[PDB]
Amino acid sequence: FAPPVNVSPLIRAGRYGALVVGIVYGSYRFGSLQKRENEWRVEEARRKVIRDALNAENKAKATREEMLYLAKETGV
Partner 1 sequence: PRPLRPVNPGKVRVGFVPEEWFTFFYNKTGVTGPYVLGAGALTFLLSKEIYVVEHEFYTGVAIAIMGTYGVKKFGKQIADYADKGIGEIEQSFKEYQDSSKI
Partner 2 sequence: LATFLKYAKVELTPPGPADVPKIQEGIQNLIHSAKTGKWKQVSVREAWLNTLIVTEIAMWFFVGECIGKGSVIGYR
Secondary structure of residue 2 in the 3-state scheme: coil
Given partner 2, partner 1, none, residue 19, with its beta carbon under 5 to 8 Å by kind, binds partner 2
| Host H or E run for residue 6 | none
Contacts to partner 2 by CB under 8 A: 1, 4-7, 9-16, 18-27, 29-30, 33
Give the x/- contact pattern for partner 1 in 7-46, rule: CB under 8 A: xx--x-----------------------------------
SS3 69: helix
